[PDB]
């Protein structure tokens, strides 16, 4: 087909999926405020769609909009290459499960991905602490406790954990030194928190109110900024919108104030994807003939995703990032990070 002479953007229904689910994530929590990588869950639910059948796969291909073994092939492309990037997934199983030979080559074609025995029956808390330091060390010691204490218990059979680092590192840095306080509305009210500041061309949208700016990185990354309109200050982007905002984007002037900030957030996803369409997975019902050979079901995915947003990383329109906003990390058309800001936490000049 056609190629982008702008950089390419996001496959249609991994654009789909992801703004789906992040609705679903944002309405969950009082102000908002999320980060995730639809990269990893998606690859991670396209991995477990490649070993079940039935109304299991099928609830799964549903919510992805797409058949695994395609989607696979295309999110693998989306992390290979990047330096700055620290991947790491794990489906642990119990010692008594067996895993088909099939299912591990499928999960070992995806990048720094991995099924591990693990003996939760006989010592839950070393389990915890094995599947802790795994992520811990894959991560760059970013993501050190993935699995919080208790949560490890005797009787599960087959747990998925996944964590994704990054830190963009920006193609024009900001300069550190105008770097200033500015006042940011939050959810306990207006508070002074350093903001990068920034004037150069860059790519800009608007669309029905709201307002974006890309900044360009390293190694293919881009990560788009927005703003919702002010009369709807807590309002979530839709694909829609986001399919129109890229569209309508221009290179423009702009004089960008950018807090610098820093997030990330444990989630247990089985309560967001019932919601979505995505039950019988973690059910005795689950049809998982592709992964063992004795019945089998997951009990839980937790995914953990950390960015940092800092100077370096490693006819002028104003744009002042100033209340909450939106950030969409993306490359070679998936999204490695999808987050709503509402109360920025400074990681610092160091």
């Known amino acids: 087909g056609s190629v982008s002479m702008s950089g390419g953007f996001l496959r ?15 309405e969950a929590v009082p102000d908002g405020e999320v980060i995730w990588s639809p990269y990893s869950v998606a690859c991670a639910l396209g991995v ?9 796969r099928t609830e799964l291909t549903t919510l992805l909009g797409t058949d695994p073994a395609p989607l696979l092939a295309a999110l693998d492309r989306a992390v290979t290459d990047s330096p700055d990037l620290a991947s790491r997934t794990v489906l642990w199983v119990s010692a008594d499960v067996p895993v088909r030979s ?3 080559a499928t999960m070992h074609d995806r990048p720094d991905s991995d099924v591990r025995t693990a003996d939760f029956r006989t010592n839950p808390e070393g389990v915890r602490a094995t599947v802790n330091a795994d992520i811990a060390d894959a991560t760059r010691g970013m993501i050190r406790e993935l699995l919080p204490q208790g949560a490890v218990t005797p009787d599960l059979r087959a747990i998925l954990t996944n964590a994704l680092w990054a830190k963009a590192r ?3 840095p900001f300069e550190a030194h105008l770097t200033r306080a500015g006042t940011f509305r939050t959810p306990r009210g207006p508070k002074r928190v350093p903001f990068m ?10 669309a029905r109110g709201w307002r974006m700016v890309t900044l360009h990185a390293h190694d293919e990354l881009a990560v788009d900024v927005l703003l919702p309109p002010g009369t709807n200050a807590a309002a979530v982007p839709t694909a829609p919108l986001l ?9 423009t002037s702009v004089e960008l104030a950018l807090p610098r900030f820093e997030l990330t957030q444990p989630h247990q996803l089985v309560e967001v ?14 049809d998982l003939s592709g992964i063992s050979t004795v019945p089998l079901y997951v009990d839980t995915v937790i995914h953990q995703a950390r960015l940092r947003v800092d100077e370096r990383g490693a006819r002028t329109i104003r744009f002042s990032v100033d209340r909450p906003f939106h950030i969409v990390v993306r490359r070679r ?18």
């Open 12 to 26: 249609d229904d991994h654009l789909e999926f992801a703004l789906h689910l992040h609705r679903r994530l944002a």
């Open 48 to 56: 477990l769609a490649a070993g079940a059948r039935a109304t299991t």
């Open 102 to 104: 099939s299912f591990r």
């Open 170 to 172: 920006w193609t024009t």
């Open 197 to 206: 500041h920034r004037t150069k061309t860059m790519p800009y949208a608007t």
């Open 243 to 251: 399919t129109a905002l890229h569209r309508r984007s221009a290179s």
């Open 273 to 286: 994807l019932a919601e979505a369409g995505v039950r019988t997975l973690f059910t005795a019902s689950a």
């Open 333 to 350: 058309g998936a999204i490695l990070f999808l987050g709503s800001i509402a109360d920025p936490h400074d990681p610092g000049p160091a």
